[PDB]
Write a protein that binds this ligand. Structure first.
Ligand SMILES: O=C(O)[C@@H](Cc1ccccc1)Oc1ccc(-c2ccccc2)cc1
Lengths: 270, 270
C-alpha cells in the first residue's frame, strides 16, 4: 500500500524538521534578498570578516590573524565545530528512522561513520548558491570567492562542494524530499564492515520505495528525478574522498593544527 | 507509450548479442553452472599458467619463466590487449544506441573515453565468481587465488573487481537487463568536456525509462531493483578511480623501452 509509504514520508519529514534547525526552506528564504525581515551580513574579504565578529556571534579572533591563528585556520576550526554539530543532529535524525535502533549496535556505528559526511554535503547544498554559503544559522553569508582566496591549501577545501551544490540544487528538491533521501543514504548496507546486511537492505528498500512515490507525487513533471537523485550519490562519494585526502595534507603542513576526536574517528583512508 | 521502451530494449539486446562474443548466459553456463561439454583450462598455479599459455588460444607472448620476463607483467599486459579489443566492441554497440551517432562527434568521443572503463568492469563481472574469472573467449579460468598471489603491485589489482562482481552478480541481472544498463552508462552527461549535455541527458532519460520497465517485467519479485542497480554506479566509479591509481604506480615500475614505441602506442591510457 502506497498509503503506508506516504505515512513513512510524513514521519521522516517530521523528524527532519525536529532535528535540523536550518532547513532548506528557511535557507532559501534568506538567500533570496526578497524577505528583508532579517538579512545576513556578508563576508567577502578580511575587513568584512573583522566586522562580522561584531555583527554576528563569532567567538573567534576579530583583529589580525597572521601571527595569531591566521584567517584560514580560524575559518577551518569554526567550520570544524559546526561539523561535529551536524553529526549530533544527523545522529539524532537517524534514531527516528524505523528499525535503525533495532539493528546491531555495531552496524549502527558503521552506518553513521560512513553516512555522516555524505549527508553533511547534501544538506550543505541547501545553504549554497553559486556565489556563497550561509554561516551561523543564516546570520552570515560567506563569499565563494573569499573562501577560494584563502592560503594555498585551505583555498580549495570548499570549491568542490560549491560545484556539487550548483548542480544538486538544480534538481529543486525540498525538505520533505531531502528527509527521505538522507534516510536512504544512512541505511546503505554496502558500507565496509557491516555484520548484518539483509536487515539493513530491507529497511533501505522500504525507504527507496517511499522516496520514489514522494518524488513522483511532489514532482509529477520531472522525468527520472528518482534515478537522477540516486546518481548524485556518486558525486557525494568523490567529495568525501577529496576532502579526506586533503586533510592528510594539512595534518602534515600544520602540525600545530588539531582535528576533533569524533571527526578524526570517523575518517579512514583507502 | 510503453511500446517504445520495449522496442528500445529489444533493439539494445539485439546489438548487445551481436557486439559481444561471450554473453553472460554463455559465461554462466561455463562457470559454476554445469552445462559441461567443454570445460575450461583452470590456471591455478605458476605451472598451470606456464603449462597452459602454450596450449590456449592467446595472442601476445608465449610462456617463459626463467630469468626472462615476469609472469606478473605478461598477465597484466595480457589484460590490456583484451581490454583494447573490448573497447572496439563497446564502441560498435554505442553507435547502435538511438541518437548516439547524431550527437556532436566530440561528445561521442568524450562519452566513450570515460564510459569504457565503467562498461568493462560491469561486463567483467559476468565472467567472474567469488573464486575466479573466465579467460580467453571462455576457454580458460584463472582462479582468484593465483591472481592475489602475484607480485606486490599486481596482487591487489583484481581483488577489488572480484569484490564488486560478488555484490553486482547478487543482482542476478541478465543480458537483456545489462544491454540497457550499459547504454545508460554511456549516455552519462556529467562527463567532463561535453559541449551539448541536453541531447545526451535526453537520451539517458529514455534509456532510464526503458531500463526501469525492463527490470519491472523481467524481475517482478525483485523489489526496488532499479534503484539498487543505479547505486552500483558508485561502486564502478570508485573501481575506475582506484584502478587508474595503481596504474600510475605501475608506471613507476616499467618505463623506458625502445622496443615498445609502436606497441605501447596502442595502449594510451584507456
Ligand atoms: O556556520 C556554518 O554553518 C558554516 C561554517 C562556518 C562556521 C563558522 C565560521 C565559518 C564557517 O557553514 C559551513 C560551511 C562548511 C562546512 C563544512 C563541513 C564539513 C566539511 C567541509 C565544510 C560546514 C558548515
Amino acid at each position: 500500500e502506497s498509503a503506508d509509504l506516504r505515512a513513512l514520508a510524513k514521519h521522516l519529514y517530521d523528524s527532519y524538521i525536529k532535528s535540523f534547525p536550518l532547513t532548506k526552506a528557511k535557507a532559501r528564504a534568506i538567500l533570496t534578498g526578497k524577505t528583508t525581515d532579517k538579512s545576513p551580513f556578508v563576508i567577502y574579504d578580511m575587513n568584512s570578516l573583522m566586522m562580522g565578529e561584531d555583527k554576528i556571534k563569532f567567538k573567534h579572533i576579530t583583529p589580525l590573524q597572521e601571527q595569531s591563528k591566521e584567517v584560514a585556520i580560524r575559518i577551518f576550526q569554526g567550520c570544524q565545530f559546526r561539523s561535529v554539530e551536524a553529526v549530533q543532529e544527523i545522529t539524532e535524525y537517524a534514531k527516528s528512522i524505523p528499525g535503525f535502533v533495532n539493528l546491531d549496535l555495531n552496524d549502527q556505528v558503521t552506518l553513521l561513520k560512513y553516512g555522516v559526511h555524505e549527508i553533511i554535503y547534501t544538506m550543505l547544498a541547501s545553504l549554497m548558491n553559486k556565489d556563497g554559503v550561509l554561516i551561523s544559522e543564516g546570520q552570515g553569508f560567506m563569499t565563494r570567492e573569499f573562501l577560494k582566496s584563502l592560503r594555498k591549501p585551505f583555498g580549495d577545501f570548499m570549491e568542490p562542494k560549491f560545484e556539487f551544490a550548483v548542480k544538486f540544487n538544480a534538481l529543486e528538491l525540498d525538505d520533505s524530499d531531502l528527509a527521505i533521501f538522507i534516510a536512504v543514504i544512512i541505511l546503505s548496507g554496502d558500507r565496509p564492515g557491516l555484520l548484518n546486511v539483509k536487515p539493513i537492505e530491507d529497511i533501505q528498500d522500504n525507504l527507496l520505495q517511499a522516496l520514489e512515490l514522494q518524488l513522483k507525487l511532489n514532482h509529477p513533471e520531472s522525468s527520472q528525478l528518482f534515478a537522477k537523485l540516486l546518481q548524485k550519490m556518486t558525486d557525494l562519494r568523490q567529495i568525501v574522498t577529496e576532502h579526506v585526502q586533503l586533510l592528510q595534507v594539512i595534518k602534515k603542513t600544520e602540525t600545530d593544527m588539531s582535528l576533533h576526536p569524533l571527526l578524526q574517528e570517523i575518517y579512514k583512508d583507502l
